[PDB]
Amino acid sequence: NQYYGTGRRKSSAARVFIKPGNGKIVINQRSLEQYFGRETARMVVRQPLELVDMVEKLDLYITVKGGGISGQAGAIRHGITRALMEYDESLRSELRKAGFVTRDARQVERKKVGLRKARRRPQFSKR
Amino acid sequence: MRDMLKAGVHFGHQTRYWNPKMKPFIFGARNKVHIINLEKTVPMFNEALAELNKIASRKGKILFVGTKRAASEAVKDAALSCDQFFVNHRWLGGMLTNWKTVRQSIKRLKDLETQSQDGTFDKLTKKEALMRTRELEKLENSLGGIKDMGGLPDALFVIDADHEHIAIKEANNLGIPVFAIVDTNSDPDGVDFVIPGNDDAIRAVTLYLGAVAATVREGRSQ
Amino acid sequence: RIRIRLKAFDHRLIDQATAEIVETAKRTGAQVRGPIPLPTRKERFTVLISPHVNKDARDQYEIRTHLRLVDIVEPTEKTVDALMRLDLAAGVDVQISL
Amino acid sequence: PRRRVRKILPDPKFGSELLAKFVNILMVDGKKSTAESIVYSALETLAQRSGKSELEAFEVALENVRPTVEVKSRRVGGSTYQVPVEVRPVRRNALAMRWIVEAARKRGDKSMALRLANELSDAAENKGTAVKKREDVHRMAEANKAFAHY
Amino acid sequence: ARIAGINIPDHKHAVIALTSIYGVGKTRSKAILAAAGIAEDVKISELSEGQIDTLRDEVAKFVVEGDLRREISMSIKRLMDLGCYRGLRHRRGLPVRGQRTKTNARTRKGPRKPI
Amino acid sequence: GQKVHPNGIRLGIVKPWNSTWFANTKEFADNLDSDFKVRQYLTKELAKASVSRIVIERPAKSIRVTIHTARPGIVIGKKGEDVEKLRKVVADIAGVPAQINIAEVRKPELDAKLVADSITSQLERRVMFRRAMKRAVQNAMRLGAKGIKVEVSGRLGGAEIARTEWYREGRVPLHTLRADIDYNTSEAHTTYGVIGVKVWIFKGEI
Amino acid sequence: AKQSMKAREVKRVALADKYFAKRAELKAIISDVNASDEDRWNAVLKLQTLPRDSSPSRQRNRCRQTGRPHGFLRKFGLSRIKVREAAMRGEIPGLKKASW
Amino acid sequence: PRSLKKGPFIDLHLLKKVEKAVESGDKKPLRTWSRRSTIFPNMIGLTIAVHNGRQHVPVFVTDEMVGHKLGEFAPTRTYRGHAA
RNA sequence: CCCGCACAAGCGGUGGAGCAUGUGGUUUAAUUCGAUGCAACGCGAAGAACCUUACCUGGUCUUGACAUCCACGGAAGUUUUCAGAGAUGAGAAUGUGCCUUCGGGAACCGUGAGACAGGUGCUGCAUGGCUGUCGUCAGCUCGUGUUGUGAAAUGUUGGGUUAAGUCCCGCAACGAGCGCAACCCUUAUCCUUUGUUGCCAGCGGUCCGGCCGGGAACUCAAAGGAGACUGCCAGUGAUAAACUGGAGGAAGGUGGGGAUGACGUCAAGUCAUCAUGGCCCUUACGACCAGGGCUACACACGUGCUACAAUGGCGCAUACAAAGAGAAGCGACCUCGCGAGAGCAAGCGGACCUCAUAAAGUGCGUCGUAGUCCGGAUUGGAGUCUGCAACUCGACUCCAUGAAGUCGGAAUCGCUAGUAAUCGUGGAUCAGAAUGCCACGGUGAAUACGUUCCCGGGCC
Ligand SMILES: CN(C)[C@@H]1C(=O)C(C(N)=O)=C(O)[C@@]2(O)C(=O)C3=C(O)c4c(O)c(NC(=O)CN5CCCC5)cc(F)c4C[C@H]3C[C@@H]12
Ligand SMILES: [K+]
Ligand SMILES: [K+]
Ligand SMILES: [K+]
Ligand SMILES: [K+]
Ligand SMILES: [K+]
Ligand SMILES: [K+]
Ligand SMILES: [K+]
Ligand SMILES: [K+]
Ligand SMILES: [K+]
Ligand SMILES: [K+]
Ligand SMILES: [K+]
Ligand SMILES: [K+]
Ligand SMILES: [Mg+2]
Ligand SMILES: [Mg+2]
Ligand SMILES: [Mg+2]
Ligand SMILES: [Mg+2]
Ligand SMILES: [Mg+2]
Ligand SMILES: [Mg+2]
Ligand SMILES: [Mg+2]
Ligand SMILES: [Mg+2]
Ligand SMILES: [Mg+2]
Ligand SMILES: [Mg+2]
Ligand SMILES: [Mg+2]
Ligand SMILES: [Mg+2]
Ligand SMILES: [Mg+2]
Ligand SMILES: [Mg+2]
Ligand SMILES: [Mg+2]
Ligand SMILES: [Mg+2]
Ligand SMILES: [Mg+2]
Ligand SMILES: [Mg+2]
Ligand SMILES: [Mg+2]
Ligand SMILES: [Mg+2]
Ligand SMILES: [Mg+2]
Ligand SMILES: [Mg+2]
Ligand SMILES: [Mg+2]
Ligand SMILES: [Mg+2]
Ligand SMILES: [Mg+2]
Ligand SMILES: [Mg+2]
Ligand SMILES: [Mg+2]
Ligand SMILES: [Mg+2]
Ligand SMILES: [Mg+2]
Ligand SMILES: [Mg+2]
Ligand SMILES: [Mg+2]
Ligand SMILES: [Mg+2]
């Protein structure tokens, strides 16, 4: 019936519901084109289905909260990947090879005392 | 004597490497090799077995120090058949002179030994249990012979005074009689009962080791 | 409905205090919704640690305020009696709302 | 570094990792969308002026800007000798793309897309400051051809 | 073209062209054009001489150019004559609005006068 | 270098807090100030009673003070008369009804504060610092400390140049967060000024 | 801090409590849109005549242990130095060294 | 500047000294430390000796001064140049 | 022989401009004191109008502003008047309580002694405590043994190896301690439990709003677990430690980040947080007050912010965060104002309410390379708010003004990845007063051949 995957990226979390269909993609009650202006974001979302060739064989219902454009697109990609592996477990190795199965664990590094940012140190002068 | 030279007690080391102090126990320099004088050997070998009996019939302890890749096996047998102690791998410098400390390594081995049999190992992790497993084996190679030896020895049967210069020097400091198979290429000065002998050939070593096995065993019999 | 909000600086205390509150209520003919773990407030403090200068030498401290919500639904009279005679650990702030 | 120890995602429109790298070199301040728009605008202009494809016309510009050899200040007692070193193929592209972008930024046309299309078309015909820097790098490598083997 | 005794740029949009007048910024410019019923983005060249006359009438409601220059000059003269703190700052060519003079104040002081 | 406070670093790991009340911001500073005044009063009043630790709870509209002491009988007094004096004064300071409990320190030689206070008492009576330090270390190790460190710093023996002297026996693994390191300090107010004492007592891991 | 400086703060807190209601009443009149210009004027003049130390803005938060007028934290009522000392002895409930 | 709804600030002690001075026609300078007081129309013609930190600077009040603070006419810092 | 953003390779800066800010200097009545190569200079100060405040000028007090003790009057208070800049002085109303053995008390006030109080006065080179620093560098030691007449050595060197005195092996050392690592926090995956204030997959609605029944799935919340060990595999290696790949896995070799700072070094910093030996002042070096100063300005240096534009400015439309704060507080909605704001006045001690709108982005339009539709300094006028009070010396708004600046010489700084760069957001301090500090997400690079050189360091 309905295959689910949670995906996360930076501070984004995506809830991806996949059912058999005809290439419908809804994201927060909006089309993929409406939700993401960026073609990179759109590419990121479509990557898993283009890889497995199920672009027009599956309807995706997606909700996504938190982070930004790229975070959300990456969260969605991770969610689709996980939904696809629930749908068909044979796809794992192909999706694994593409790098889509990994939860990208790169987060904003905290600001530290005595630094301007996480690593940016204040300007030194000899005297 | 005919069996001493069958065993190979007769043929000492090359003449290049000789210690001049061992010249009285060198009959020939035949074919670029010093040959140990057996007429000096046999009288001196029996007075060693004499004193080993007198020590072992006082019911003291012999330490069979022979830490070369050839006699490590036989010192770990000529002290088991004998019911005595051995060092068959690296003599830890300070085994006797620093016995107070080296006895704490004995105690740690015995803790680790119980842990291996009981399987407190099994309760600990791979990293932890296998580290204390390897620590057991390292302690056993060094101090396996001298574990049941809560006390400084009363004698120190040595093979090759050259190799066990540390052990002999320790025994000389503490006042323990050494019974060394002193070779032609080796210093006899520190040794108490010099046995002039080839100290390398397994067959030469086994012969000595069966005699010192008996004399101590016969000490214990009476 | 009795809404019980528990606050504490130690989560082990607050979990003990909720365990007792759900015990007393479920004994006494009440339907207990919870304990619901509400967001922990992490209140952070950064102090200079030198008495003088050394601005980059600092300690960062945190008070975590743990928060649990227990709702006692269709509460019995036995329920309300038993809840008031309970004695939770000192260290747990207990706010009751009806 | 003292101990020798990312993968660029291919660009959406054309599927090139080389053009993805080109966008990254053009990009400032993490503004990749802005950089993407410039490059795709420039490549449309470049594809329309040649009749060659966007990536094909890009490759022809890179062909003419890529250095084969460069100098490295390799200090070996007394003075420091500029030693001609073969540029490895990834660095050839890296330098070419960096020089094109550097050249395009120096130009006087209105938008960067136009500045970039002009520099790429100029690169293809061997008449820009990017091509000039490749020629400058080559002649300094030619002038120090004595100090190979170093 | 000629409003308030200055030549306004003919090529520029009216909203920008009128800011050539001393005393007309972006806000007043928008108000003048709103009051004249002229769109902001009409080039001054494209306006009829009827429309330029309406702009002259709207600009005349504000104090601009020499009239504004005399008001500002008189306002500073008043302070300097009073000998109030602000007056003294005007006289000495130092910041008048509390700013530091240990460093900076270069807009008021001009270029660095080396010792 | 400078070292983290051994108690502070272990506060949620192996080491409890000495104040275990909850408060919102409204009451928080007031409670800290009343706790300070209670600890100040009791520390002064029980200076000869070998008080290690004063734990303060605030259950509801009250204060509960546990006094950890090596000499509980002297604190409690004759049929609880002296502890009743403390309770009334604590109740005035806190401005709420007070309960005082007395916990016994069975082993004062293993209590870092009592060891520190013992050394500083001896230094104020002009005992040789090295003698006081060595006995403190000896006594703790005899009574089953897995290790102890004692540091004494200042004008030792009324020297003009201040110096730090320390002695350690056993393990004192200060980077091990699960190490039960009892740490405390004391000041000897001598004729030549302040000698600071620091005591670390390791009582095993976890 | 000096004993006198601590005493000044006590005086300021006491006066601010004493006159709080009067000051609030006068400032209500001064603020009020519907008040007379006479009543607002008189209220302006009256608020001046009250002790300056009755204004709460005259109070400086000081460390309640030392009187330090800098480095204060309101949560604790202490300077940064005394917060740290208390924190490390386990005397500030819940407070521990923070990492994240 | 002070919000118009609150009116101009003057210290009551100065306000009463000015009222007395005007009502008596007293032309002796009014000594004040109220630098923060607004100059009112009734002060016109009075000399007000305004404290500058160390001296009372005589300010002969003119109509142009009305609405300024008294302290504006009594500079507190002495400066005659660096190389003076 | 090794290592580290040390260099190289890169990317962005500083140095030039304006402004903010600290310092030096100079000035001043005072510009309070401290910090001074790295390791002082947006440092103590997490916020100087008054206060703070330590300084100056002047006005004042002398057992005192702040304690304890005694004696002698008085409840405490609350009102209010005059004089005075105020400190304070002189009054005038109005209380007459609380324990009570009915003798007293002791609440809180004078007032008189003098024992003392008081001191941000001096010495950080008399000190404690706390801190910086080499440096999170891999070191530093000890017992016993042994070597040397001895200072000392050995261990700790050596062969491999590691981020690491990390580990293995050898070895007159054998062990041990403090460091390294681990245990702690956080982050990345999953599971269990709980399900409101959070959630909405499937239902039933529906005003289209998780809005309402409901649901407990999912996001998430936060407790408890699981997970990563070079465990597995292959090769290499001394039948070693380890190393190089591979698999699986959310994660791989210390996964990322933090906390954690050995013995010691610099008589390093701090007697002005505090404490403290000694010294010094005591009708003054103490104390109170108003006003001024700490904000001065020929100038020099450090740290920043904003720019110089078109990868941009402006206008319009329109997406997507995280973290946090809040009761003398956060303050919605509505109304009024061009606006800062104001007036009403909900809600919220908070997953509920409020701050609060992310901005960069995207789309459309415009400007067309100009000292400009760049920049936003400076100055005039008019305001708002906080606050007894914004003259010296606040922040903010509106109108007007529209400076320098066209990418910065020698030199020099940061950074190796969710980093740099760039974009907003929040917090502490705080009545008000950030371009600083601390924190939070968004977008998101380049480059690293290498170790010759520069700097700091480790081992022989
Ligand atoms: C930063 N700087 C200026 C120096 C610097 O660069 C370094 C450094 N290590 O780099 C430093 O050491 C310093 O900072 C520092 O701390 C100094 C002192 O303490 C100090 C001191 O206190 C006394 N004291 C007395 O003679 C007291 N008296 C006894 C009789 C009466 C007077 C004498 C004395 F010469 C010194 C040396 C200074 C030097 C100073
Ligand atoms: K204009
Ligand atoms: K200024
Ligand atoms: K010190
Ligand atoms: K030794
Ligand atoms: K002192
Ligand atoms: K001032
Ligand atoms: K700045
Ligand atoms: K700068
Ligand atoms: K402009
Ligand atoms: K001001
Ligand atoms: K620059
Ligand atoms: K504020
Ligand atoms: Mg960031
Ligand atoms: Mg800084
Ligand atoms: Mg909150
Ligand atoms: Mg200013
Ligand atoms: Mg004091
Ligand atoms: Mg204040
Ligand atoms: Mg104005
Ligand atoms: Mg470089
Ligand atoms: Mg500059
Ligand atoms: Mg200064
Ligand atoms: Mg100093
Ligand atoms: Mg000083
Ligand atoms: Mg120095
Ligand atoms: Mg002041
Ligand atoms: Mg008066
Ligand atoms: Mg003093
Ligand atoms: Mg010092
Ligand atoms: Mg060493
Ligand atoms: Mg180690
Ligand atoms: Mg967990
Ligand atoms: Mg792998
Ligand atoms: Mg560690
Ligand atoms: Mg010094
Ligand atoms: Mg003052
Ligand atoms: Mg200053
Ligand atoms: Mg502009
Ligand atoms: Mg705030
Ligand atoms: Mg805000
Ligand atoms: Mg836009
Ligand atoms: Mg690095
Ligand atoms: Mg920023
Ligand atoms: Mg090393």
PDB file of C-alpha atoms (C1' of nucleotides) and ligand atoms in Angstrom, chain I residues 36-38 266 268, ligand 26:
ATOM      1  C1'   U I  36      52.230  45.720  27.845  1.00  0.00           C
ATOM      2  C1'   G I  37      56.254  40.910  22.711  1.00  0.00           C
ATOM      3  C1'   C I  38      54.043  36.027  21.192  1.00  0.00           C
ATOM      4  C1'   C I 266      57.748  32.992  32.653  1.00  0.00           C
ATOM      5  C1'   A I 268      53.921  36.006  33.905  1.00  0.00           C
TER       6        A I 268
HETATM    7 MG    MG J  26      58.713  39.981  28.992  1.00  0.00          MG
END
